[PDB]
Design an enzyme around this catalytic site. Structure first.
Site, PDB file in Angstrom:
ATOM      1  N   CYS B 116       0.580  -1.189  -0.049  1.00 17.34           N
ATOM      2  CA  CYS B 116       0.127   0.062   0.129  1.00 17.34           C
ATOM      3  C   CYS B 116       1.086   1.343   0.092  1.00 17.34           C
ATOM      4  O   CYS B 116       2.092   1.169   0.503  1.00 17.34           O
ATOM      5  CB  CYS B 116      -0.883   0.016   1.068  1.00 17.34           C
ATOM      6  N   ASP B 118       0.631   3.657   1.856  1.00 17.07           N
ATOM      7  CA  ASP B 118       0.561   4.285   3.255  1.00 17.07           C
ATOM      8  C   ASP B 118       2.214   4.468   3.490  1.00 17.07           C
ATOM      9  O   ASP B 118       2.756   3.894   3.459  1.00 17.07           O
ATOM     10  CB  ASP B 118      -0.060   3.432   4.297  1.00 17.07           C
ATOM     11  N   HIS B 185      -2.388  -3.518   5.191  1.00 18.63           N
ATOM     12  CA  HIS B 185      -1.741  -3.162   6.639  1.00 18.63           C
ATOM     13  C   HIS B 185      -2.979  -2.905   7.367  1.00 18.63           C
ATOM     14  O   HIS B 185      -3.917  -2.879   6.858  1.00 18.63           O
ATOM     15  CB  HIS B 185      -0.934  -1.832   6.473  1.00 18.63           C
ATOM     16  N   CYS B 196      -6.237   0.729   6.734  1.00 10.96           N
ATOM     17  CA  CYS B 196      -6.081   1.205   5.504  1.00 10.96           C
ATOM     18  C   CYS B 196      -7.304   2.245   5.123  1.00 10.96           C
ATOM     19  O   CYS B 196      -8.241   1.735   5.087  1.00 10.96           O
ATOM     20  CB  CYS B 196      -6.192  -0.067   4.321  1.00 10.96           C
TER      21      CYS B 196
HETATM   22 ZN   LIG Z   1      -3.654   1.788   2.956  1.00 10.25          ZN
END
Ligand SMILES: [Zn+2]
Ligand SMILES: [Zn+2]
Lengths: 457, 457
Positions: B116, B118, B185, B196
């Site tokens: 991801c 992130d 995650h 997420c």
């Molecule tokens: Zn995410």
């Protein structure tokens, strides 16, 4: 580096003193502002700023400029505008028959000079040509020396009527003429960037534009009036790097050749080590050889005695200015002085009291609608000159009025306010940021008249 | 609080030192700015600011940032942007075969990881997985692990062609596969707010989205090519609070079950007090029991030897990261570190040199038009993170180009400028307030290539 025998030393010193004083008055504002910006906005801000202003600029500031600075931040832009206006006022106040006889002896009853509106040509009369502004000497500057034919024709008609009715310069039967001088400028060091911006810094383009305008004015005078009315035309080029003039000598009939001219740089070079009388002999013959030269300078006949005497006097006067530049700057203006270094934008009729080189950008206009391009050019110049440093642009809207005509002063004040509002609504983004400061002034058309400030509203 | 026998102590110390140095370089800017704001804008402002900057940030500042501050006020936003760009440059410059053999022994000729976008997953390779970036290891991060099928298929085709023509990893006849890893995650402490964000902080939603994307990629590879071409898929979940991974073990045919996985938290708990070889035995059998478990984890057969060896190595590597987090933060990240704590917005291909957890918000996009939502999400995050404190948002537009393709660098620079202008015209209100600072950079696609700054215009 020796002194030319014909240099006017005390006049050069006097001129340099005036130039230095005026430029210092305009330039000392910025360091004062930088000092002010470091003063904390406490309870002593107003008193400290006022005493600092009295010590530095010689005058105090209105409390309205500083009363609410503690909440609105430092009013550096307003102080800048006020100080610049005060500097201009101080310069004008500090500034505030033989020429007519000399013109008459040369065969002219009026001299009209129309230089380019470039700031580097601002001191053309008192410095470069050493010609005082008299009741019969006029200076109408236009962008690119593109002077307007109609107003020149009107001025010619007025002068001729005055000669016919009263004969103030001389009686109408005298064989004198009206002399129109067009001045173009060029740069020797940077011909392609420091030339006439109105013609893309092209020297020959400026030369031919000025010559064409002179020819058009002469032909318009000839067409508009009969009995063989005519005028005399003169063309002068100025090297802004050295303040040296090349004068295009007319032939016997008065026509001008872009290649037949006397250059004062070579004249100064070849007359440096001689004696006054010998130098006068040299320039007197040099005019003749230039006017009699052949090839591209082929001319019919030779110029009259009055024309040659006038041109010789002009060259002798310009020798002193060449010497002045050599003394003050070692033969050439500093690189900062070569380009634009103006301090404010002059809009209207300009000031006859601050004729100093590269002091102000002049935009000859009676209406923003008619000559907006001059205003845009000035704003573009000062965007690099001032807006890059964050300083506002100062603008002096000055106009002249005739007190003899009833109601002239009120109309002039209305015109000044209209111009101020028009410049305000244009560049409104600059207006909202307080980046435009204005001062509006009027003056009687007579030489030496007081300058009267008017309110912007 | 004892140390795991399998922890890599010196690697943990080295990683912690790099993380601390980079984060300190990014964070020390704000106190310097706060000190600068207290310096009066006098005649000593520029000199004092420059010497303070040299003493604090280790570098000076351009005079254009401070030359006109006395009239325009403190240029704190510009100094912030410049200092943040310099910090990023310093971090990248400071950062600037065995892995391939290990992959080949496990039966893969290429490993592709798509975590991801992130920021908490930024250090997934060097910290969480301890996997170096090689010529056959790729990291393409997308929002919500929603990696694009077409580019992955193109990469697979390129790798297979390289195997067929030159056999750079190995010859085409070798029974190795292309490995695609998808990483989601979740947050144990705050599942409903720190999950997420692309899936509304829903753990199972992120899991099924990643699994569906992996299945789609596998089926697309199978459909696009014949002769039984196929790939291997792996699914990994990361607990951002403890940096612990749960690996979903594939069955004999390679299918993944959202419930059949090995969790490294319980593994760390149950292997803490044993010895290295015994712990290795434990994880080797634990993979087998998890893969052979029944109920919701019902799977057909057991995973291959290479798959199990790779997963065991991944778990052993993640043990060191778990120990690192336990040492540095007492078993869990501080509450400020749990959520968003990014320092700048990375737009483009990202930086492979600053792979540090929660350092930057990454928006994988080649056009603002295509992926505007990532830019809006980043701006919304930094509105709370930075705009609440009055600081501007720093944005690094970085892109990679292939020097082999002629004209690639110029096209990449044009793309970077286009992205910068597009982000400028959007959020124009933030632009007018100087709340967006930019730095544009390009880099050759080869690992370790220098980063070249480009002008915004
Ligand atoms: Zn995410
Ligand atoms: Zn000009």
């Amino acid at each position: 580096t020796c002194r030319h025998p014909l240099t006017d030393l005390e006049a050069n010193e006097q001129l340099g003193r005036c130039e230095d004083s005026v430029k210092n008055r305009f330039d000392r504002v910025i360091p004062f502002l930088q000092v002010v910006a470091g003063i904390p906005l406490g309870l002593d801000y107003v008193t400290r700023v006022q005493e600092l202003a009295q010590s530095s600029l010689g005058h105090t500031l209105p409390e309205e400029l500083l009363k609410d600075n503690w909440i609105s931040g430092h009013n550096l832009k307003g102080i800048f505008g006020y100080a610049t206006a005060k500097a201009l006022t101080a310069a004008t106040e500090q500034f505030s028959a033989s020429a007519i006889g000399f013109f008459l002896d040369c065969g002219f009853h009026a001299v009209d000079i129309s230089p380019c509106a470039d700031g580097r040509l601002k001191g053309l009369l008192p410095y470069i040509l050493r010609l005082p502004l008299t009741a019969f000497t006029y200076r109408k500057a236009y962008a690119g020396s593109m002077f307007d034919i109609e107003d020149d024709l009107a001025q010619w008609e007025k002068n001729e009527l005055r000669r016919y009715r009263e004969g103030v310069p001389n009686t109408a039967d005298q064989p004198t003429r009206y002399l129109k001088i067009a001045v173009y400028h060029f740069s020797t060091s940077d011909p392609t960037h420091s030339g006439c911006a109105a013609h893309g810094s092209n020297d020959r383009a400026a030369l031919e534009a000025a010559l064409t305008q002179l020819m058009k004015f002469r032909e318009a005078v000839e067409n508009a009036h009969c009995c063989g009315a005519s005028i005399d035309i003169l063309l002068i080029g100025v090297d802004t790097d050295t303040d040296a003039i090349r004068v295009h000598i007319p032939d016997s009939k008065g026509f001008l050749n872009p290649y037949r001219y006397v250059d004062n740089t070579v004249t100064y070079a070849q007359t440096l080590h001689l004696a006054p009388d010998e130098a006068r002999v040299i320039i007197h013959e040099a005019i003749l050889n230039a006017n009699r030269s052949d090839g591209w300078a082929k001319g019919n006949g030779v110029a009259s005695e009055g024309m040659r005497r006038f041109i010789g006097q002009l060259l002798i006067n310009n020798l002193s200015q060449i010497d002045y530049v050599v003394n003050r700057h070692g033969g050439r203006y500093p690189p900062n002085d070569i380009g634009h270094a103006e301090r404010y934008i002059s809009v209207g009729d300009g000031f006859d009291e601050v004729q100093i080189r590269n002091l102000a950008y002049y935009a000859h206009l009676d209406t923003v609608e008619e000559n907006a391009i001059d205003v845009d050019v000035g704003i573009k110049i000062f965007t690099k000159l001032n807006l890059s440093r964050g300083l506002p642009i100062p603008i002096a809207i000055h106009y002249r009025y005739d007190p003899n005509v009833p109601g002239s002063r009120e109309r002039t004040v209305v015109k000044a306010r209209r111009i101020y509002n028009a410049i305000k609504e244009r560049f409104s983004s600059l207006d909202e940021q307080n980046l435009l400061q204005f001062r509006l002034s009027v003056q009687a058309q007579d030489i030496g008249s007081p300058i009267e400030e008017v309110a912007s509203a």
